[PDB]
Motif scaffolding. Sequence first.
Motif, PDB file in Angstrom:
ATOM      1  N   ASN A   1       2.362   0.680  -0.844  1.00 18.26           N
ATOM      2  CA  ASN A   1       3.154   1.909  -0.828  1.00 18.26           C
ATOM      3  C   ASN A   1       4.612   1.740  -0.412  1.00 18.26           C
ATOM      4  O   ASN A   1       5.449   2.575  -0.744  1.00 18.26           O
ATOM      5  CB  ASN A   1       2.454   2.988  -0.003  1.00 18.26           C
ATOM      6  CG  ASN A   1       1.128   3.406  -0.607  1.00 18.26           C
ATOM      7  OD1 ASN A   1       1.083   3.986  -1.702  1.00 18.26           O
ATOM      8  ND2 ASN A   1       0.040   3.110   0.102  1.00 18.26           N
ATOM      9  N   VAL A   2       4.920   0.660   0.303  1.00 19.44           N
ATOM     10  CA  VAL A   2       6.312   0.347   0.622  1.00 19.44           C
ATOM     11  C   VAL A   2       6.821  -0.888  -0.142  1.00 19.44           C
ATOM     12  O   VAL A   2       7.799  -0.783  -0.879  1.00 19.44           O
ATOM     13  CB  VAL A   2       6.553   0.217   2.151  1.00 19.44           C
ATOM     14  CG1 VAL A   2       8.005  -0.107   2.446  1.00 19.44           C
ATOM     15  CG2 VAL A   2       6.161   1.495   2.853  1.00 19.44           C
ATOM     16  N   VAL A   3       6.156  -2.032   0.016  1.00 23.28           N
ATOM     17  CA  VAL A   3       6.603  -3.279  -0.623  1.00 23.28           C
ATOM     18  C   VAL A   3       6.614  -3.239  -2.163  1.00 23.28           C
ATOM     19  O   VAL A   3       7.618  -3.599  -2.781  1.00 23.28           O
ATOM     20  CB  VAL A   3       5.793  -4.516  -0.150  1.00 23.28           C
ATOM     21  CG1 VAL A   3       6.287  -5.776  -0.842  1.00 23.28           C
ATOM     22  CG2 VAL A   3       5.881  -4.683   1.357  1.00 23.28           C
TER      23      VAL A   3
ATOM     24  N   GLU B   1       7.194  -1.256  -4.326  1.00 25.09           N
ATOM     25  CA  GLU B   1       8.154  -0.361  -4.965  1.00 25.09           C
ATOM     26  C   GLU B   1       9.329  -1.127  -5.579  1.00 25.09           C
ATOM     27  O   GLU B   1      10.210  -0.531  -6.192  1.00 25.09           O
ATOM     28  CB  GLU B   1       8.641   0.690  -3.973  1.00 25.09           C
ATOM     29  CG  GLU B   1       7.578   1.718  -3.619  1.00 25.09           C
ATOM     30  CD  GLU B   1       7.534   2.890  -4.590  1.00 25.09           C
ATOM     31  OE1 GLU B   1       8.438   3.747  -4.517  1.00 25.09           O
ATOM     32  OE2 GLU B   1       6.591   2.962  -5.411  1.00 25.09           O
TER      33      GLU B   1
ATOM     34  N   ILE C   1       6.717  -9.776   8.147  1.00 23.64           N
ATOM     35  CA  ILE C   1       7.910  -8.972   7.846  1.00 23.64           C
ATOM     36  C   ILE C   1       9.113  -9.836   7.415  1.00 23.64           C
ATOM     37  O   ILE C   1       9.846  -9.487   6.484  1.00 23.64           O
ATOM     38  CB  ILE C   1       8.265  -8.007   9.009  1.00 23.64           C
ATOM     39  CG1 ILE C   1       7.371  -6.764   8.927  1.00 23.64           C
ATOM     40  CG2 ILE C   1       9.743  -7.603   8.967  1.00 23.64           C
ATOM     41  CD1 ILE C   1       7.623  -5.747  10.021  1.00 23.64           C
TER      42      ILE C   1
ATOM     43  N   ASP D   1      -2.007  -0.827   3.074  1.00 22.95           N
ATOM     44  CA  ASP D   1      -1.437   0.500   2.857  1.00 22.95           C
ATOM     45  C   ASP D   1       0.083   0.377   2.810  1.00 22.95           C
ATOM     46  O   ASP D   1       0.756   1.087   2.060  1.00 22.95           O
ATOM     47  CB  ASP D   1      -1.865   1.430   4.002  1.00 22.95           C
ATOM     48  CG  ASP D   1      -1.437   2.865   3.799  1.00 22.95           C
ATOM     49  OD1 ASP D   1      -0.967   3.220   2.695  1.00 22.95           O
ATOM     50  OD2 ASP D   1      -1.577   3.657   4.760  1.00 22.95           O
ATOM     51  N   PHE D   2       0.603  -0.537   3.625  1.00 25.65           N
ATOM     52  CA  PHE D   2       2.025  -0.812   3.709  1.00 25.65           C
ATOM     53  C   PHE D   2       2.507  -1.563   2.465  1.00 25.65           C
ATOM     54  O   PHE D   2       3.538  -1.217   1.878  1.00 25.65           O
ATOM     55  CB  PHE D   2       2.285  -1.622   4.980  1.00 25.65           C
ATOM     56  CG  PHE D   2       3.670  -2.166   5.091  1.00 25.65           C
ATOM     57  CD1 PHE D   2       4.770  -1.317   5.138  1.00 25.65           C
ATOM     58  CD2 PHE D   2       3.874  -3.540   5.183  1.00 25.65           C
ATOM     59  CE1 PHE D   2       6.048  -1.823   5.250  1.00 25.65           C
ATOM     60  CE2 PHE D   2       5.156  -4.058   5.303  1.00 25.65           C
ATOM     61  CZ  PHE D   2       6.240  -3.194   5.336  1.00 25.65           C
TER      62      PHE D   2
ATOM     63  N   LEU E   1       8.362 -11.160   3.859  1.00 26.88           N
ATOM     64  CA  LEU E   1       8.476 -10.074   2.876  1.00 26.88           C
ATOM     65  C   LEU E   1       9.938  -9.732   2.552  1.00 26.88           C
ATOM     66  O   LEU E   1      10.266  -9.394   1.410  1.00 26.88           O
ATOM     67  CB  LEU E   1       7.706  -8.827   3.321  1.00 26.88           C
ATOM     68  CG  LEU E   1       6.178  -8.906   3.498  1.00 26.88           C
ATOM     69  CD1 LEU E   1       5.660  -7.710   4.305  1.00 26.88           C
ATOM     70  CD2 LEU E   1       5.419  -9.044   2.171  1.00 26.88           C
TER      71      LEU E   1
ATOM     72  N   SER F   1      11.822 -10.222  -1.293  1.00 24.48           N
ATOM     73  CA  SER F   1      12.708  -9.170  -1.762  1.00 24.48           C
ATOM     74  C   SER F   1      14.103  -9.684  -2.161  1.00 24.48           C
ATOM     75  O   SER F   1      14.679  -9.229  -3.148  1.00 24.48           O
ATOM     76  CB  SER F   1      12.795  -8.083  -0.686  1.00 24.48           C
ATOM     77  OG  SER F   1      13.995  -7.341  -0.772  1.00 24.48           O
TER      78      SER F   1
ATOM     79  N   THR G   1      -3.613  -1.021   7.543  1.00 29.55           N
ATOM     80  CA  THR G   1      -2.227  -0.569   7.661  1.00 29.55           C
ATOM     81  C   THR G   1      -1.332  -1.448   6.785  1.00 29.55           C
ATOM     82  O   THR G   1      -0.470  -0.948   6.064  1.00 29.55           O
ATOM     83  CB  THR G   1      -1.759  -0.557   9.146  1.00 29.55           C
ATOM     84  OG1 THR G   1      -2.518   0.423   9.872  1.00 29.55           O
ATOM     85  CG2 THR G   1      -0.278  -0.209   9.262  1.00 29.55           C
TER      86      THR G   1
END
Lengths: 193, 194
Positions: A110-112, A114, A55, A106-107, A58, A62, A103
């Motif tokens: 669908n989240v990162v 973007e 986390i 999937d994370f 990541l 960003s 997870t």
Amino acid sequence: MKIAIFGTVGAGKSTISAEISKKLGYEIFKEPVEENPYFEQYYKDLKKTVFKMQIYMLTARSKQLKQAKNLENIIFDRTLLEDPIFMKVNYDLNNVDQTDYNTYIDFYNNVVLENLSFDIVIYLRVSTKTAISRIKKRGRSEELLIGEEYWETLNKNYEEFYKQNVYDFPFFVVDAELDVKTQIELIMNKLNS
Amino acid sequence: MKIAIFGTVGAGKSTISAEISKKLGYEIFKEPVEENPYFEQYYKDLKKTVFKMQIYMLTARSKQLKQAKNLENIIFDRTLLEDPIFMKVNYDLNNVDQTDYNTYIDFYNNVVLENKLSFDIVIYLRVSTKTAISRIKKRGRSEELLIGEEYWETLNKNYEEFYKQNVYDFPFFVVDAELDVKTQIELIMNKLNS
Ligand SMILES: Nc1ncnc2c1ncn2[C@H]1C[C@H](O)[C@@H](COP(=O)(O)OP(=O)(O)OP(=O)(O)O)O1
Ligand SMILES: Nc1ncnc2c1ncn2[C@H]1C[C@H](O)[C@@H](COP(=O)(O)OP(=O)(O)OP(=O)(O)O)O1
Ligand SMILES: [Mg+2]
Ligand SMILES: [Mg+2]
């Protein structure tokens, strides 16, 4: 000209980027290592830190993207899309089970992802043993704390990432077993076109 | 008409959402609780599971967003911006230290908050901790019984704090959730008809 240097821990990405940054006079972008509060923890206890580490890293990717995608001349030590490699490693070594890895992926998708590019991605292809020795003399003392299995599994997955190349990086391969001097000559040559 | 129902565990969000749907026809969007592989684990051992739990939840939220985006009428059992409340709770209760907390929010701001749903009304089901704990026992989930009362206290405190601060400037409508269900629906329908 947007340049990235790609490869496992101890491949010599820092030595190579520095030399380039001297020759062409661009700025190097580097992920937090001294500033990462989880760094020592991570190597003492993978199982307990993998998620915290991930986390943190990541978030840092960003941030780098925010500044980078408005600059013409850049050098990148590692790209933004290489964090799943370290997760895939812990998955292979049973520090992370199927559910967690599902997870995470999937994370990640669908989240990162973007947030959604380089001119050349230099791949410093190297054997495990050589990288291990470069950790001993050039890398961080924390990195000395986990076993070889980790580095083997990392190298394996790095080549895997290069062979599958799911993001379609304009890759360029350099045999990092050669001494830095030769590596630089081959890199400067390729860059001249 | 986009409706969101807001409150602590055992506020009676499911009951209320079900009643509204019954009158209006709108689809309810629950969170994954049953298909959540960390659910029992989370209450059994918070410290070891909070991060795993959180990652799953934000992933779930993002899916709900990406399926309710285009719908004219929705009822949301909880909004997508309330996960940090749970993390803050665990921070007050020393399940998570200062760094981990900062890492979580630093990530939330830079990744999650950068992006969209606009609710016409966010209905705060306001309850005492005592009423909530008994509703957990009545119609809650069996796993929610596994931790001490102090968890629910802090969670209610943080929920009250979220509403008072109103960071995201939600169009809040407070309902006294101590009231019987029938009466709550009367207050809600009356407001909804505007
Ligand atoms: N996603 C991640 N998960 C866990 N550890 C990570 C992650 N990303 C980076 N790291 C760790 C591994 C390394 O110790 C360090 C990353 O830098 P590294 O790959 O060693 O490049 P470097 O700049 O040191 O060049 P080199 O080691 O190639 O000379 O941080
Ligand atoms: N981000 C999160 N972190 C930790 N736990 C969570 C998170 N999101 C949800 N949960 C857990 C806490 C509760 O056990 C459950 C949330 O459901 P809950 O608050 O009971 O709503 P509900 O739909 O059951 O309505 P109500 O209980 O108000 O009738 O899932
Ligand atoms: Mg290194
Ligand atoms: Mg409930």
